[PDB]
């Protein structure tokens, strides 16, 4: 064993890249499916409560990745990858969970959208500050600032598509829901099977128990910290729970796309497999916590 991935084969890499970019397009269009400008004006009056959730999820996510990296003294590059993992919008799935259980979707979607179009703002600065903290900031000259911004703007293009679509005929979202479900299911299964077959040996390099423990705890920890903070600021139970679970689940697609495009494939290697395990684990744990809550309200 202890062999480097049998790399050099481009067509599989390109298939990975193209499916990832198209899922980025479709998910950010699904963001554009939601109308918010009407709520933007109304919520500008008292956004302080909303802004608290925003700054909380912007702050906790990096520091959590930082502290879990430190506590497991994780090697530098995968700790950096985890840092990328913590910082991502992750709103569609959260919206789905909340709609499944309860809540006013109007808030969840607007926090998601503003998280997106402020991520390009705070993303680079948080990367810059917390890169220095790994040991001395060894990656300082490897962070692709402008390339990250390019990835971000390509992500943001479907946001522009959706927002201008609001100005035009909103009827198009009547068919939008179907297609969205089919494309998300197909892309999920496709990435699973392709990222499995394309590299087999390196998966064992990507399955270290430390990675499993982090990918499990840190989203759960995000849930807990959102819960406790929203309890601290006297917010209602429903808003507290919504913001908690919105924090708990991130954007695997954005992180994966940044990992593949911003850094060399051999640099990321099977560590690219981490966000998939992440995402499936938040799916499982979110369902479990939904069931646990429905048990709690009973008794």
């Amino acid at each position, epitope marked *: 064993f*202890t062999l*480097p991935p049998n790399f050099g084969k481009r067509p599989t890499d390109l298939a990975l890249s193209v499916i990832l970019v198209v899922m980025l397009f479709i998910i950010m269009l699904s963001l554009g499916c939601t109308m918010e400008f009407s709520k933007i004006k109304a919520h500008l009056w008292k956004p302080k409560g909303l802004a608290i959730a925003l700054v909380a999820q912007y702050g906790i996510m990096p520091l959590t990745a930082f502290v879990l990296g430190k506590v497991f003294r994780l090697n*530098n*590059i995968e700790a950096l990858a985890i840092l990328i993992c913590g910082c991502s919008p992750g709103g569609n799935l959260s919206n789905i969970f909340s709609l499944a259980m309860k809540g006013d979707m109007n808030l969840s979607i607007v926090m998601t959208t503003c998280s997106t179009f402020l991520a390009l703002g705070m993303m680079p600065l948080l990367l810059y500050i917390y890169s220095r903290g790994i*040991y001395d900031g060894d*990656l300082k000259d490897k962070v692709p600032y402008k390339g990250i911004v390019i990835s971000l703007v390509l992500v943001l293009i479907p946001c522009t598509i959706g927002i201008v679509l609001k100005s035009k005929r909103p009827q198009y979202m009547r068919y939008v829901i179907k297609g969205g479900m089919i494309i998300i299911l197909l892309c999920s299964v496709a990435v699973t099977v392709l990222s499995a077959i394309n590299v087999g040996k390196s998966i064992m*390099f990507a399955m270290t128990p430390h990675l499993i423990a982090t990918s499990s705890l840190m989203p759960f920890i995000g849930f807990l910290l959102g819960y406790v903070l929203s309890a601290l600021f006297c917010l209602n139970g429903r808003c507290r729970r919504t913001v908690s679970m919105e924090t708990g689940c991130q954007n695997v697609q954005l992180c994966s796309t940044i990992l593949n495009v911003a850094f060399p494939p*051999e640099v990321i*290697g*099977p560590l690219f497999f981490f966000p998939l395990l992440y995402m499936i684990f938040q799916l499982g744990e979110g369902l479990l916590l939904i069931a646990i809550f429905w048990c709690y309200e009973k008794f």
Partner: nanobody, 124 residues
Framework: QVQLVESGGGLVQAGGSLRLSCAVSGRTTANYNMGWFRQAPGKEREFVAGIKWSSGSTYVADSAKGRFTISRDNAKNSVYLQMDSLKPEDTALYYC???????????????????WGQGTQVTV
């Protein structure tokens, strides 16, 4: 910000355990790999061997199994590639390179590495 430098002058046919030593000067931090390379005329650089400076795990490319090695000199800030006596074939310019990247596997790709010494030219 690490400066590299090499020392090798073995130009002989098979039967020479050629002393190769790559003195390293710089921030010898943790978790940085360091490797050795090739330049035969007209073909690009390609990986041969490497080792994490911190843990000490080494790897060997296919051509060098049983034929090369690498040794850490961490107290004196040196790396020690003793290539075993090799056929007249392997005549090539060799290099040194190291990345601060720390990972379980061995990074192999040409373009990844950053710090380059004045790699020695040796024939066999």
């Amino acid at each position: 910000q690490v400066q590299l430098v090499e020392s090798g002058g073995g130009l002989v046919q098979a039967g020479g355990s050629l002393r190769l030593s790559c003195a390293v000067s710089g921030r010898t931090t943790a978790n940085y790999n360091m490797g050795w390379f090739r330049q035969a005329p007209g073909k690009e650089r390609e990986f041969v061997a490497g080792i994490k400076w911190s843990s000490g795990s080494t790897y060997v490319a296919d051509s060098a199994k049983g034929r090369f090695t690498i040794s850490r000199d961490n107290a004196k800030n040196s790396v020690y590639l003793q290539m075993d006596s090799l056929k007249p074939e392997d005549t090539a310019l060799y290099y040194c390179a190291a990345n601060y990247y720390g990972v379980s596997w061995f990074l192999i790709s040409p373009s990844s590495y950053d710090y380059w010494g004045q790699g020695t030219q040796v024939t066999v």
